[model samples]
Target chain A: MDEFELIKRNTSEIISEEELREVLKKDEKSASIGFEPSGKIHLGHYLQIKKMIDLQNAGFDIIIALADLMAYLNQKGELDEIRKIGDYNKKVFEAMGLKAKYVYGSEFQLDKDYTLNVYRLALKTTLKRARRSMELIAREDENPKVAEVIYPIMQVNSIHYEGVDVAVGGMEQRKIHMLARELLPKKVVCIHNPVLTGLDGEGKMSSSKGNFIAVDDSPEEIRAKIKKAYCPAGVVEGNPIMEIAKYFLEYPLTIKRPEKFGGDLTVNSYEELESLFKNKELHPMRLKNAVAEELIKILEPIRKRLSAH
Target chain B: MDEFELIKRNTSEIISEEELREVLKKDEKSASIGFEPSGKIHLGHYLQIKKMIDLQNAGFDIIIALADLMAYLNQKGELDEIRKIGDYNKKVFEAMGLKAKYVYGSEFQLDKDYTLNVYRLALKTTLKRARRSMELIAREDENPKVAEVIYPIMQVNSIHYEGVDVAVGGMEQRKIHMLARELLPKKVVCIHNPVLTGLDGEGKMSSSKGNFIAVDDSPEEIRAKIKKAYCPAGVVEGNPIMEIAKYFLEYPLTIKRPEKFGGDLTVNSYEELESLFKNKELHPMRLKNAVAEELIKILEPIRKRLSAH
Candidate 1:
């Protein structure tokens, strides 16, 4: 099956094409997405790039905003390093087959007219709202750095300054975006996506960890990573491999046991897959191998293209 | 008598020169006077400018910050007319013989890097202190505007941002500048000048009601304006000419009258000037004319230069 069809069927649990289409229908013309260039893009970035490309193919104008200013603040004003990190993010987008227009927050020069307007907007927003947005974007260990505290306001202002009709980010960013909706000039909309888990079976995917599979990972590397993943008992509970399978694999393919090794002889739906595993009809090893193979097939072409680049 | 002598003798009743001098002496180098660029600077601005020039000649680096951003917010983004107003201010400053080095603001786009640093510093100050500063600045208004509420933080930021060693402003600005002294980086000092009363014998001088003289006013204009100025009995409250004489003239400079005029009385202090007036020993008309003549002499060079410009 095509990647779109595969993604539609399997990832429907997390995000359905219907839902994406609904979001697109709001304004199918063009859309922009911004990312804080705090670090290198790994497997987590692929999810966003994939969404952007999908929108682009569906005839949407795409803009990829490089949030270097946010990264500068996040990194405590080590702007040179932040710019380098931002360059890596830009490279990732280029490698991800993203033909979207590019915009860098650093390029806008936050110290100019843009920032003045943002300060005004920040004043319009209450201290409570600014504080709440800060908490949302800050790292757990962050000691409430002043920049981190003001980032949400800047983020909202960035959107306002960009004159975008919609803003997109991970679910963790939902609170900030919601605040932006209230504080922004009433015409802008916010679109959010769920956080994707890391391949190491940890929490959200992070670039610093080696667990994530890069968009440029080889099919062999993809397979190896999947095989060694932490998916136990074929159960989906916090199992990163199953998350990949359920989100990236769909239709004509299914995870099931051999005829002599399983009850009812087949499993199609993720629910059925879960039930069979719970009933001990499907072995964890069999499920892992099947999911690994599916993921390899899915990522192979993208990886090859990335390698060529 | 010279301008400094006049100011030293007369202007101290309402606000003391010793106090002003003490504030000025604290910073041996750079000093600045601030004003809320929210409105067209009227007659009150000329007095502050005169004070600033005095400090400037005393080896202080002067700065006239155009606070258009604060004005914009104070007016709740009703900025439609602000640009023109701000331009008018720039013109007025140039007309008043302000050196290019002595004037700056966000409006001038001076040192984007420095401005950004100032913004960051403002963010560091506590909201409560900022609120109080706003209160002090807005105290004159029956219902203070929102911009008035945030004006202090902006003012404080300007001082630190410009790296001024000392700040000078009207007495009403004292509390805010004091807060700035407490809040800004350790090296800055604060100076406060007394408010010059209005030409209509009101509590403060204002150009909004045509109650004061413009520095650029011709000699004839100055004489005519002074003639129409409100000066009542020496004991009368809010007598503009008397206040000017008592504060800007007799107190700062020791003016002596011969025994032919009354007694061999020499007014050595601001208290003596007030006493002479109250006892009818110093006539109100004489004080008014003397104050006017001193003001004309003091402003003559500046007015001539302004007219040439």
Candidate 2:
């Protein structure tokens, strides 16, 4: 794929094509994504990891910030305990087979220059604007903490301090990344990958809701989740099966089955699978089993590799 | 005066008399007051300076935090320039004969522990509460920056990290200090001195409006400003002359003048001056001149001592 195509692949939003094109020209261009390290890295996180991988292939150095303090502020745990989680999450990123530099936010966020810039950014940002940029959480945090309005500014500052030319995250982060473009204009391009829908037919995959597939799920567990996943016959919209197929399965997906189950079939690309599923030519159960088996194989190496950490 | 009496004197509000009594029981206890190094250390700031003196006299260690970053966040100046002003302000504090530890906010505010606590405090504090805690500026800041809501949390964190047993500031800080008490209950006692009114007959004495007397102002400037100051006859309420007399002039204040004008006048205590001024027994010009002269003498040693720096 070309540089722009690689950067644009499988994503929901690229803040600006012009900015991304200009930054892609620099020999040492860099991209970054920040995570709270609050829960198990799940299929929900895979889209961001894939975007980071794509950026790496586009000749951009990638930086992953394990946002330990961000988690602590989010009430995940005590600082030291939160840091331990960050360490585990860091190992998972390294095990993902992506060439990226890993840094803990605690490493530079507490640095004199980093925090002062946060304060400076806060000075320029309006509370109304800051609050507007915060992505909605699991439920409304009524009377949310001051950090809710503050951490968004810290995210903007991280791009400057880490020397990130491009920023990557899931579509939920689009508001804040767009806010950054307006806040620190001409400094960074932002790419937001599609948000993974939960298997339970819920809106977004959330660990707190237990509606997500853990990246390290056992083969049996992956099969059970996909089997029970919400998939309506002849209806592909908002279907987790379609989403999984789109994100994980390569084009021209190969399906195999014994006689009397439509025998065997090959559906090329996500649109083809959707078309066939809509026509009832391909069964939902067949799609579910095949995607589940594919995910099990995909997760095996990552789970085993993570154990070494 | 007794230790408690001295500390309580000339103060508008003490968060709790009981909490302060407990701290006084300890032989080694510390108190702190934070100040922005944005402008000249003026008469408005002296209210806090005098409270520091009282705390020192009460056998408590005093900590002065030169809030240079607070000033920078307030958009006063560049960081280096703000630090320079903080250094100069520290010298001026030393010249006021305050024997205490001086801390730059940069020294600790940027430390991992300090900034972390600030973030933690932010999590507990709500934006509405934080915004409510910020005092309205001299000119109304209708749409305030996010930093205005943030710095109050930093002020609370400073109280904890500075190891202060007590915190002091002018009455305008009462709201935020009250917030700190609510945020970290039972940690520190807060004392608020009455806000000094401006000579311009405006709301508060402030450097931005050029409505304050700088601590090191020459005697001539002091006299001239006071001469032209707003002092209404037969009205002692919100009168700068009455406030100055109450804070500075010794009891049984002796006023000497030409026989044609009111000859000689002697007022005992602030109440006596308030009574005389309200009764029109004292002219506005006589009160202004007397307070200005007294202030000049009071400021002389401090000015001379600061010159050595």
Candidate 3:
């Protein structure tokens, strides 16, 4: 499917068409959009890079913010190690053809001033509200510490102060973006994109799991990772391949396969693709292989671009 | 009253003389005290400062810490504001004859290769515990924000990381000091001193109120302030003058009453003086006048030293 339709279907679960239109309008009106970097841009982060690139191509200026302090504090290892990862992430953004102004949060004149503003906002927000927001995003049964509870508020405050008309992030960040919409001075639009799951079929794709295929990964690595993915037929419940295909490939692309391929060829919408998958007409293996090929093709130029950077 | 006896009467409400002696022995053997500069050294801060000074005079190596970031986030407006206040407070300490090794909390040597030790200690104390400690000091019925709630934990973490053997503050800070006693890896003594209230008989002596007599108040200023103080017979119930007399003068000094004013007298003990004041044998006016005189004498050197600095 075309780029407009691609974004429409993939992001529909988190944002409505009306909201998308609003975001597009904002993109047209605003000179620039910005992001705060937390760490290395994993495969999970590719969706955002893609969206930013899309917006850039549509004539909007993009600003990539490196959240140096947040990354320094949140990463589990040394600062030097984190800095290395951050540098690599910058390369990834460049590889994705996202020609945004790179500004580190620690170095950003606006971000530093904005952090202090957030501290004030934090003093104003109740412990109950902070705790509730944390509980929403925190792993279930995880009794988050006070700092963790304040994390989302900080994130929302960052968005509010950064002056982004349309904020974007992975689906897990939807709750916080909604909070920003509520807390921001003016009503702001949020663009939440669907996240791809790990190839191992457990949860969201993570670098630590060895299940995520990096945009910079070679074609052989992509093929090998896909071949080892959990994609059983009736096990479609947590099958990472099917989920990825549905969320990132078929749904995003609005592809309708021919009857020989177990789909109604005349169908032209995401709903038809969903019905075909649910009715067991779309073979899970074929879907996975197709997704693997599409992802490789989509990622090849990004990898080459990143390497040049 | 000698030092041994003075320690007993004021502390009898909290612990036995034997317990005080044991703690004093432990302190003499190995106590290392520290204070954090989280805000301006207001009149309310004198209790802790005096406690630390007493500890230093008693032969403890003191650590005067500037809680730079925490103070910035919790007390001052922000980091820049905190730096300004911290510089002012550090100057105040120097003026007040603080010979202790001054350190800033943000400059503490942390193994940056690992997770910040302060952050770990912060997480070690549960939110409920931290909240309770802050609630104990906060004005009753005042709904505290998340920043205020987590402030005590940060204070405790400072003490633990500084390797302080004794943590001292005003009675209002007892809750936080107690948490340090419970959470610090090593054995630490917690000292809670009564807060000196305004001479106007207010709840606490604050610089914001004109009634407070600073350590640098002129002799005439001290005498005039004390003469006009709200001190009356049986007014010890809430009277700041009587409380000051009881805690600092009657409890610490042996005064000689002149014969021309009344009967010639030598107060052999604090109890003897308390009995005389209670029985009206010692006129309230005479006691107030004498207390004011003694206070001036005590503060004279402090003022001179501050001026020298």
Candidate 4:
């Protein structure tokens, strides 16, 4: 595959595709993804980590931000507590094969230059505009704290300070990424990977909802989670199982069923599976069992690798 | 006068006058007033500086904050330029006879403890609450920058970090001080002095419009400013000259005029002059001349003291 296709694969939007090509032509450039450091490394993080691995193979130096400052500002926990969570999350990402530089927000958050830039960034951004930028991803929905408004500005400052040429996050981060693109001294290309639908067929994935699988989940855990996911028959548009097949399943997978249902079938690619499902040729329970077996095939190895850590 | 009376003198509101008494009973406690370091130290600043002087005499330690960070954030100038203005303002404040500690916001703003406290303060404060606290004192009245909301929280952090028990400012500061009292780790006694009206009978005195006298003004400049001051014939409320008479004019000040006008009059106190002016016995021009002469008498010595530095 060409560099452009490899870079854009599994991504929902590239802020400027032309700019991405221009930046790729440069020597020794960098890209980054900021994580608020979750309690568990889940499928959501693994999906983005896989993308970061692709960029690393494409010859881009990657940065994974242990964004403890933001979590603390969001009232997640004490500073030391948040830092410890970040440390654990870093180990999990390493296990997932993202060989990248890990940065803690606190390392330079209080540096004189960084602090001054925060003030300068605040001076340029209006209070109203900042709150609007945070509408999609802010921690608090009603009556947000002042930190909610300030954290987005701090993230913008991080792009310049980290010397990142490309910023990566889920589609929910578009507003903050666009803010960084507009306000940073030089421009940065923003890459937003699609947010996976929740296993219960909800629109977005979040750690708070239990409708997903963990990256380090055991084989049994993976089997239980996949069996419970919402996969209605012949409904290709909103089925989480079909969505997973599109992003994670390789071509020519085995689909086993009883002779009366459909017998054994070979699904070549995402397109072949979607067409058969929409035509109601595949049953919902059979699809759920097959997808669960495939997920276990991938997650069991990840679980073993994570256990050695 | 007693410590309580000295601390309370000429102040418009004290968050809790009793709290002031309780904190004053401690062996050693501090107080501070934050200023953005104007190019010239005007009477508006002098009114609050004198309160700091009074607190010093009452056995409380004083901290005069040279808020260069705020000035830069408010778009006054670059950091170096703002610091120079602070340096010059520091000298003028010393010349005004405040023999106390002087602090630059840049000195501790980037400290890890201070910066974390700022985040903590922001987390507890809502954007609406912080903006409400800045209503009277924010630099930008319409479409305020995020810095305007943030600077108020920074000032609250300074109170705990500086170990201040009392916070002082003009009435414009009452809202911010009250925010500190409401949200800080411990309550602080807030002392808010009345704001000086502008010389043109406008609402507030500022250095921009040439509606106030500077501490370093030449004797003739002081005379010229007082000449243009708004002194109505029989009204003391919102009268700029009468306001000056209440804050700057000493008791037993001599009021002079031609024999045809009110001749020479001796005012024993602020109330005595206000009573006479309310009865229309004091003409505006005669009051203007007397107050101008009194201002020159006080300001000439200040100019001498400042020149030596």
Candidate 5:
């Protein structure tokens, strides 16, 4: 695939494809994604990391910001604990085949100039706008804390301070990315990856929800999770199993079954798989079993390195 | 007067008289007041500066925070201009005879620990609580900016970072100080000076309203502002003239007039002035003349130093 194709692969939205094309022509460019180092590194996070790998292959330097300070501000934990979590997150991202520079928010978020810029940004951002940016990701509360608004301003500053030409996140981060483009002195190309459904058919996969497949899940754990995950035959929308097959699995997926149950099946693309499933040609059990095996192949090495520590 | 009396003199309220007494017993104690450098320094500022002096005399070290960064966030002006105002303000405060250790918000407000603490404070502070703290001082807006909430958290952090055993401000700051006491790990004594009414009787004297006497206002300008100021006979409530006499003047105030009117009246205290004004025994002209004269005496030298530059 070409640079633009790689950067655009499997993503839900790219803000201003024209701007992205211009950035692709630059001699040197960088893209960034930040994680607030909270729960276990799961499929939700892997989806974003995989995009970073694609960007790296597309000749873009990648920055992974371990936002320990932001996590502390979000009441995740103390700074010490948060930093530890950040280290684990960094290791996991690297183990997942991403090549990039890693940055801790504590490294520069508190620098005098960065902080001054945040205050400047805060002055320009109204409560209504800041509140709206956090609507998708913020914990629901009748009386939201001031940190909810500050979180987005800090996220905006991260894009500028990191000096990245491209900003990347899941669809949940669209508002904040939009805010960055508006508030920043210069425009940046933004890529928003698709959000995935949880195994339990809840909203998005979340750390607190326990409905996700962790990057370090054992093979047995992966299999168990896939077997019980929410999936209905011939239903694609909001189906976790179908989403996994589409986003994570490679094209030409093959499922092995007993000779009596229609022995084996091979599909060339997610679209083809979708068509087969729409016509009820593929059973839900076949899809789940195939996904579990493909996922274990992806996670076994990660689980090994994670356990080495 | 005793130490307690000196510290408590002319103040509207103290968070706790007992806490203040305990603080007074400390061999080494510090007090702080911050000013967001903006428009001309006015009599409203003097009320708080004078309180800082009282704390200094009562055996407390004084810290004056020139909040240049805050001024920028408050949309006062560029940092360059705001800092210039800070210099002028520092000179005026010293000229007003306040001996303090001057610190700029830029000096430490952006330090890692300080910024970290502010984020931590933001997490614990609710939007409702933060907004309430800014109610009196925040500009009226249907859509308030994020800085409105951040300003109070910064103010609260200033008290902690300045390491002051006591925090002082005009009555307008009562809520923020209360917020500080609740948010800080350790308690600090708080003194709230009375908020003087504007010359237009439109609430507190403010820089933007042009209804205040600037500390550097020339003798002529001082006389002019006071001459047209709102001073009603026998009405002490919300009376600027009565407020001036109550908060700024030394006791045993004497008002001189033509022998045909009321030759010369000497009042022993602000209470006496209130009583005489309540009974209509003292005319409005006599009060304005006395206040204008007393105010000029306090401001003339400061004006000279201000002009030296």
Candidate 6:
């Protein structure tokens, strides 16, 4: 595959494909993603981490931002506590095969230039516009804090301050990314990966929701959670198990069963697995077991890294 | 007069008279007020500037903030241009006999502790509360910018960063000062000075309104602006001429006239002037002339300072 295809693989959308193509021609470029530091580095983070690896292989320098300041504003923890969480988050990203520069949000957030640029954008952006950009991402919908308005501006500034050619985030970040394009002096190419359905199938995978599978989940814990995950027979849409198989598992998934039950099945592609599931040829339990086994292997290195630390 | 009385003299209101008395007991304390840089330092600024002098005489260290960052956000000019404006403003204040420790907002505003505290307050303050604090002071009311919300938080942070025991401002800043008292770790004594009515009688004395008499206005220009100012017979309320006499001119104010018109008059205090104007004993034209003449002399040092530069 070409660099462009490899870089955008599995992404839901790329803003300005033409600009992205032009950026690919540069001798050197950089991409950045900011994550509000979380206690658990879950499957949701894994999806973006894999994409960062793709950018790395595409010869793009990557910056992973441990957003300690953002975490504090979001009411996650004190700065000192948030920094420790960010430190652990960085170690996990490194262990998961991301080769990139890591930055704590406080490292550049308080610089004279950064603060001034943020206030500059704040003056130009209207409250209505800023509030609209934060609708989906804001922690509180009713009587929202002023931090909700400032958060998007801070993200916009990170593009310039991080000095990256591309920005990476989940599809939920599309609004803020669009705001950056409209407000920034120069536009940035954005790649948005799809958000994962939580195990309960209610919303996006989140540690706060307690529906996420952490990177360091033990093999037994992985098996237990997958068994209880939301996957109904003959349903591929909004199915957490199906989402995992489509995005995370290797293609040509093999389901080993007793000869009395459908014997052994080899699914060559995610579409084929979906087709079989739609036809009722695949059972939910069988799919869960196959996914659980593959996921355990995928997470082995992450668990060892955590255990060693 | 006692130090407490001196500090509170000519102020419209104090957040807590009790807290102010307690702050006065400290051997050393500080007071602060922030000014957005402008080309013309008018009588409106003079009202607050004079109050700073009062605080200084009360043995409190005075910090006069040249709000260059705020100027940039308010779209007054670039920081480079705004710094020059602030420099001239400092000279005018010094020439006006204000003893202060001058601080540019950029000096400590960009520090790590400052930025974090701002974000911390932003998280706690609601958009409704922040917008309310900016209502009287916002540059744009319709489709208000996000800066309106952040401005109050920055003001709240400045109370801590400036390390001042008291905050002083025109009445418009009362809301933000109250916000500071609520959000800061400790309370601060707040002094709200009266806002000067503009010469047009339409609004407060402001450079943008073009109804302001600047500090460096020549004797002739001061006479011209005051002659055109809004002062009506038997109307002491909303009368710009009366406002100037009430706030800036020392009592008893002396009105000069020939024997043919009204004899020379001496008003013992602002209250006496207001009562005379209300009873139609004080003519608007006669009062305007007296204020203009006294104001020109009061501003002579400021004009010389500018000319020297």
Highest TM-score model number? 4
lDDT (0 to 1) per candidate: 0.62, 0.82, 0.60, 0.84, 0.87, 0.88
How displaced is residue A15 in candidate 4, in Å? 1.4
TM-score of 2: 0.92
Best by lDDT: 6
Interface RMSD of each: 5.6, 1.2, 5.5, 1.3, 1.0, 1.2
Window of ten residues with lowest summed lDDT in model 3 chain A: A29-38
Q: Report the number of the highest-DockQ candidate.
A: 5
Candidate 1 structure quality by residue, lDDT tens digits, A1-309 = 443343233121222345445555554556567887745465556766776676577566777888776765555356677677777778768866789788887676455777666666655665556666656566554234344445677777777777665566666777677767777764455455556678777787777455776666666766777677777774667777666655566644655444566533345666666676677667767877787777677766666765676
lDDT of 6 by residue, A1-309 (tens): 999999878999999799999999999999999999988899999999999999999999999999888777777868999899899899999889889999998899888778878898998888898888877777765768998889989998888888899999999889899989998877999999999999999989998544888988889988988999999999888998999988888887688878888788988998998998899988999999999999998899889977898
Q: What proportion of the real contacts between chains A and B does each prediction keep?
A: 0.07, 0.93, 0.31, 0.79, 0.94, 0.94
Model 2 iRMS (Å) reads 1.2
List of clashing residue pairs for candidate 5: none
* Candidate scoring better on lDDT of 4 and 6: 6
lDDT of 4 by residue, B131-199 (tens): 888777676547788888798888888887888889898888777787888887789998889888888
- For residues A1-309, write the lDDT of model 5, one tens digit per residue: 788998888999999899999998999999999998955898989999989999989899999999998777666879999999899889999888788899999999999899989998988899999999998867776779999999999999989998999999999899999999999998988899999899999888876444889998878888888898888989999998888888888877687777887777778898988998888888888888888999888687788877886
If you assessed candidate 3 against the hidden native complex, which CAPRI class would it receive?
acceptable
What would the DockQ be for model 2? 0.73
Tens digits of lDDT, candidate 2, B1-309: 889999998888888899899999997999999888856888878878888999998988989999887777666778899999898889888888899899988888888778877888888898888877775532245677888877888888878788788999887777788788878855689898888888887777877444778889899988888887778998777877777788776777688878887688877788888888898888988888789888998899889998766
Scored on chain A only, each candidate's TM-score is 0.80, 0.94, 0.75, 0.96, 0.95, 0.97
Segments of candidate 6 deviating more than 4 angstroms: A208-210, A305-309, B208-210, B251-272, B301-309
Q: What's model 4's lDDT at B222? A: 75
TM-score of each: 0.68, 0.92, 0.67, 0.97, 0.94, 0.94
Give the CA lDDT, 0 to 100, for residue B156 in model 4. 86
Ranking by lDDT: 6, 5, 4, 2, 1, 3
Better structure of 2 and 4 per DockQ: 4
